[PDB]
Structure 1
Amino acid sequence: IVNRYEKLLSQRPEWHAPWKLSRVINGHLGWVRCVAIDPVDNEWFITGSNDTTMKVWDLATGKLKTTLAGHVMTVRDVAVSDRHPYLFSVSEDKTVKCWDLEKNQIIRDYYGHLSGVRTVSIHPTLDLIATAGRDSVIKLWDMRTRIPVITLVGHKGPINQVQCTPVDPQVVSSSTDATVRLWDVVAGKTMKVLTHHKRSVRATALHPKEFSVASACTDDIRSWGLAEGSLLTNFESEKTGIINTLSINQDDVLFAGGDNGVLSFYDYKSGHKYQSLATREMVGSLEGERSVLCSTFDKTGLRLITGEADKSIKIWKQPGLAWNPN
């Protein structure tokens, strides 16, 4: 309609600074298909991989702190907790393990997932984590009693990212069924099922200050306030690659990594793509490989960290692009 387009044209987005590559830390001998940082501090960030390991990394130096070898198969995801000094990690060996960070050694392997487990999210407020695998089910664990407390049946296929919010919409799943769910853990049921994607929403992330949750199928990055479970915006992601990552920055600077490796940045809520970045790879590696598989920002937000399939981790420092809608 003309009534909306005109309005869109009238409104302007804020000039977010562009992004330039800063650090590249070829250290893993495998994909680096998870990355995470400490809520409390931003000194280190760990990165689980197809190595089977996960390595810890000092941001400032870029130096490899230490390794951790508590899986058999490849690590798919990790989550350092704000409220406790535990690092949860999870691998396609079906193990959702829990590393003490006072001793850097596993403690509570949680057992229950029938098959390769894709993501963890620690609940920001509770002493409870949430994991989901190709199982097609998101189980919540009491961390003390290392048992699945509840489980969330709804989904009809493998479930990827499964973020935890502190409100009522306490889990924000995202499947290959292309539904992204909002659940009520307490009710033992769904509350609202965002079906707006076309394909496997293989990426989703909570906004820090804004109580919303960007989510990405093969192209269209939707983003939504999950209070009602209502759409907020659609991003200009029109011919970008298969969106692997979908991290959001503190300053409303949503990042999206592709299977292409084209690092695409967007103003959040606007839905305005305001940068593209061509990937890079090593002289030995192939041009098809290069692809940002996992990524996240620091708590401040000036450094984006992208794990790419070059067996690398690339950290990114910081005139905006013209609007032009449909």
Structure 2
Amino acid sequence: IVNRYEKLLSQRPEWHAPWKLSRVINGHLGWVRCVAIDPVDNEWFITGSNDTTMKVWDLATGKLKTTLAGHVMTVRDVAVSDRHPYLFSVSEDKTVKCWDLEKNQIIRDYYGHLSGVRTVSIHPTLDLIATAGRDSVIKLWDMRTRIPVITLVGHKGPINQVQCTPVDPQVVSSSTDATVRLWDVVAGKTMKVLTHHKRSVRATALHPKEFSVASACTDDIRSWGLAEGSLLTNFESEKTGIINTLSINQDDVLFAGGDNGVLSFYDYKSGHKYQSLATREMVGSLEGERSVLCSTFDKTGLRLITGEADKSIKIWKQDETATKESEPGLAWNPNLS
């Protein structure tokens, strides 16, 4: 096995650049529980929240365009279509509500979950929403007729996070019973399980190119290849967890938000963790309220958006000075996992 360890002292990864804090946007009155940004014009967030509003911010200036209210209890999640001009948001009152942007109103209510709904995603080529939450099944909503065509039965626990992809394995989901399934829809059943993680699997993301999926866990953040449901890599992470979120990028940066209030960026290829940051919590807050509840990257790949339990959004910028000058991070001493 030592072979394996000799190899890891060669390749010596991919210099990436630091990050820092460009901007802080207050204005929500609760925690900020999801962010989702235009797949087209990059002018605007849309930001979930725990006061049940959803405010639409402006990317460049940081001003507030509008408020879409219209939920009773907290909104967990949002998604914005590419093809359609729609916006599905979903909350914990058990309801998955389409929106229509052109008029800024609600349109279709999809319906039938037994209990609160923690995640939506919007399949790319088919016109289908997919959703799931504490019921432990993943429903696949047809969009115009509102029928839940198919229900993916499955795990043994709340479902934290659902992702869609164009070829097979079409739908991928992770769940507090510590798996991650890879679903084959028409068949209607699981095509593969990846069991490794040790406790709940709390986040995921899809490499926007490489066709694989980062799956966090509590304290150890693996990747996985699709098609085979390989293993691929294992990011060097001591216990910094609890990992709330992942975000991949176009340059193969990886983000990961902690609840201890630490941003942890990685290279994707490697596992090398090349930067950490204490997120200055806030004015009058409570040390527990430093944490990070969501992340995403704009469409350019150069700007970071996160919400935080202290009722605010922060936007992080990729500092250009860098190169090597005195750039380097933690300097690559791969260890025995």
- Structure 2 portions without partners, runs of 5+: 319-327
Superposed CA RMSD: 0.9
CA distance in 2, matches of 1:304, 1:167: 28
Shift of 1:321: 2.3
**3-state SS of 2:315 partner:** strand
8 A Cα contact 1:232 1:269, kept in partner: no
CA distance in 2, matches of 1:158, 1:269: 30
Shift of 1:320: 2.8
Q: Report the counterpart of residue 182 of structure 2 in structure 1.
A: 182
**3-state SS of 1:6 partner:** helix
- Give CA deviations for 1:146-197 in whole Å, capped at 9, x if unaligned: 1111011111100011010111111010000110110011111110111110
**3-state SS of 1:292 partner:** coil
CA distance in 2, matches of 1:220, 1:136: 24
Shift of 1:15: 1.0
- Give CA deviations for 1:97-116 in whole Å, capped at 9, x if unaligned: 11101111111111011101
How do 1:89-238 and structure 2 match up within 5 A? 89-238=89-238
Shift of 1:117: 0.2
CA distance in 1, matches of 2:210, 2:333: 26
Shift of 1:238: 1.4
Shift of 1:269: 2.4
8 A Cα contact 1:80 1:88, kept in partner: yes
CA distance in 2, matches of 1:241, 1:19: 20
**3-state SS of 1:174 partner:** strand
- Give CA deviations for 1:118-142 in whole Å, capped at 9, x if unaligned: 0100001110010010111110111
- Give CA deviations for 1:266-303 in whole Å, capped at 9, x if unaligned: 01121111110111122211111110101100111100
8 A Cα contact 1:204 1:246, kept in partner: yes
**3-state SS of 1:288 partner:** helix
- Give CA deviations for 1:47-98 in whole Å, capped at 9, x if unaligned: 1011111111111001111111121010001000111111111101001111
- Structure 1 portions without partners, runs of 5+: none
How do 1:3-42 and structure 2 match up within 5 A? 3-42=3-42
8 A Cα contact 1:241 1:262, kept in partner: no
8 A Cα contact 1:223 1:269, kept in partner: no
**3-state SS of 1:237 partner:** coil
8 A Cα contact 2:13 2:269, kept in partner: no
**3-state SS of 2:140 partner:** strand
CA distance in 2, matches of 1:285, 1:65: 27
CA distance in 2, matches of 1:253, 1:124: 23
8 A Cα contact 1:15 1:320, kept in partner: no
**3-state SS of 2:255 partner:** strand
**3-state SS of 2:97 partner:** strand
- Give CA deviations for 1:189-235 in whole Å, capped at 9, x if unaligned: 11011111001001001110110100111111011111111111110
8 A Cα contact 2:86 2:99, kept in partner: yes
- Give CA deviations for 1:24-64 in whole Å, capped at 9, x if unaligned: 10111111111000111211110101111111111100111
8 A Cα contact 1:43 1:59, kept in partner: yes
8 A Cα contact 1:87 1:99, kept in partner: yes
CA distance in 2, matches of 1:65, 1:12: 45
8 A Cα contact 1:244 1:292, kept in partner: yes
Q: Report the counterpart of residue 266 of structure 2 in structure 1.
A: 266
**3-state SS of 1:161 partner:** strand
8 A Cα contact 1:170 1:183, kept in partner: yes
TM-score with structure 1 setting the length: 0.98
CA distance in 2, matches of 1:194, 1:216: 12
8 A Cα contact 1:247 1:296, kept in partner: yes
Q: How many residues align?
A: 326
CA distance in 2, matches of 1:261, 1:94: 30
Kindly indicate whether residue 67 of structure 2 is the aligned counterpart of residue 67 of structure 1: yes
CA distance in 2, matches of 1:51, 1:127: 30
Shift of 1:241: 2.0
Q: Percent identity?
A: 100
**3-state SS of 2:72 partner:** coil
8 A Cα contact 2:203 2:216, kept in partner: yes
CA distance in 2, matches of 1:315, 1:37: 13
Q: Report the counterpart of residue 330 of structure 2 in structure 1.
A: 321
